[PDB]
Design a protein around this ligand. Structure first.
Ligand code: 0KX
Ligand code: MG
Ligand code: MG
Length: 431
DNA sequence: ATATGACGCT
DNA sequence: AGCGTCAT
């Protein structure tokens, strides 16, 4: 009827840096540019664990979480950059500082939600509307969109080359555009995409880093759109593109469906693709997955989703962690204390930096451990008051709240051994 | 032998 | 409060 909300109220973008840690290393070491390379942690065991892979090394099948020694068998020319190590653990400061560079540039254009070290959602609804009153009724030239793909286009009688494809779809999209109607959702996305071109040009201009972006009407679609044409390209996913796109879209590819919920949707409903969800009533979906999940699934498979872009570029928690897999699991009281102290010393540096930059203090310390055999991330979390940014107090207090977990008759020893220590400062207060 | 961060459920 | 899910 005339009372159907199509989920086209917003223009939302998601910007994600291309092989981000690699780009940070490649900017600093020009010998690594335009080469198969990867960023690795801890060179001692099997060459180090790979955490980021350039697109040149991906062409050989090198992936994240692979051992560097194994990646070298797939790609003998692979160059490696090692993560900084401080206090016997990985130190990600260089990438956090690179991340702040990118976030501050994006923040100049619109309200952003920091979503990870290398990505942020952008709510462009206001910027698009303002622009719709300033760029006048002046048409949108294809030159304003030199790196944009229109998902689903070109269609019909028109190639062979990807940029030929990109242009043809953009041409079909822009020819079909009704610019005399400032409330066309498709025109709004187009203006959003122009804006995202400009903010991606600014990021590259001011940092050297390339990135990809999705532009659509909500966070889920924008994130999906972002990966469609990685790297160094952006993708507009219109409401109209959703039925064809979702008809062969595996369910696990949708944000929040990559885990157990996504698996249960597939197993319980007997489907493979996002589009098959539309044949179920909302009540049926709620009967299987809960009121909130069923409702979310019912709207989402029609391309509709209402999670807002939260105005937040600052983390809500600040944390330091280290895993101790296998025979490295911590098995004496001295080890636990020493590592807690190493974690607390890095955390104190980060928190002091945070308070000076951001006018806030953390008030609660969360201590998370994992014990050997437990396959869950955390086996146990406990908390106490974070009153002084003092590493020796924080490490001692963290020890106080977990020391009863030790079921060891001998007091020098720690049993069962700990496979993870994690200190997280939270409950930030205005200061 | 897979360093962190956001959040939901009870 | 403490645990579970989902994610980069
Ligand atoms: N488990 C993980 C996942 C990502 N990261 C770091 C390394 C990544 O370069 C950076 C961003 O992760 P990402 O966006 O998922 N993939 P990345 O940016 O490396 O390549 P793209 O696939 O986005 O082009 O977070 C990590 O340190 N541990
Ligand atoms: Mg990325
Ligand atoms: Mg990312």
């Amino acid at each position: 009827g005339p009372h159907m909300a199509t989920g086209q109220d917003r223009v939302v973008a998601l910007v994600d840096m291309d092989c981000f840690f690699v780009q940070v290393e490649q900017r600093q070491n020009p010998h690594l540019r335009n080469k198969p390379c990867a960023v690795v942690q801890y060179k001692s065991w099997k060459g180090g664990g790979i955490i980021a892979v350039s697109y040149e090394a991906r062409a050989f099948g090198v992936t994240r979480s692979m051992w560097a020694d194994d990646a070298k068998k797939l790609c003998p020319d692979l160059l490696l950059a090692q993560v900084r190590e401080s206090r016997g653990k990985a130190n990600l400061t260089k990438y956090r500082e690179a991340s702040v560079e990118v976030m501050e540039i994006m923040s100049r254009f619109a309200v952003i939600e920091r979503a990870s070290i290398d990505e942020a959602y952008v709510d462009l609804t206001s910027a698009v509307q303002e622009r719709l009153q300033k760029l006048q009724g002046q048409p949108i030239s294809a030159d304003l969109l030199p790196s944009t793909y229109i998902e689903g286009l070109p269609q019909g009688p028109t190639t062979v080359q990807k940029e030929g494809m990109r242009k043809q779809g953009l041409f079909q999209w822009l020819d079909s555009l009704q610019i005399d109607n400032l409330t066309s959702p498709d025109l709004q996305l187009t203006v959003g995409a122009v804006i995202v071109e400009e903010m991606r040009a600014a990021i590259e201009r001011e940092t050297g880093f390339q990135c990809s972006a999705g532009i659509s009407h909500n966070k889920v679609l924008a994130k999906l759109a972002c990966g469609l044409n990685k790297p160094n390209r952006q993708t507009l996913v219109s409401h109209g593109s959703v039925p064809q796109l979702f008809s062969q879209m595996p369910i696990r590819k949708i944000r929040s469906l990559g885990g157990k919920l996504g698996a249960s949707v597939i197993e319980i409903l007997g489907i493979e693709y996002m589009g098959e969800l539309t044949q179920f009533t909302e009540s049926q979906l709620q009967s299987h997955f809960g009121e909130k999940n069923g409702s979310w699934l019912y709207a989402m498979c029609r391309g509709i989703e209402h999670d807002p872009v939260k105005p937040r570029q600052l983390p809500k928690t600040i944390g330091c962690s280290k895993n101790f897999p296998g025979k490295t699991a911590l098995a004496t009281r001295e080890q636990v204390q020493w590592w807690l102290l190493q974690l607390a010393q890095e955390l104190e540096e980060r928190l002091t930096k945070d308070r000076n930059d951001n006018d806030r203090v953390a008030t609660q310390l969360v201590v998370s451990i994992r014990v050997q055999g437990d396959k869950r991330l955390s086996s146990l979390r406990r908390c106490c008051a974070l009153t002084r940014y003092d590493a020796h107090k924080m490490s001692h207090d963290a020890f106080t709240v977990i020391k009863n977990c030790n079921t060891s008759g001998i007091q020098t020893e720690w049993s069962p051994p700990l496979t993870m220590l994690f200190l997280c400062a939270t409950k930030f207060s205005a200061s």
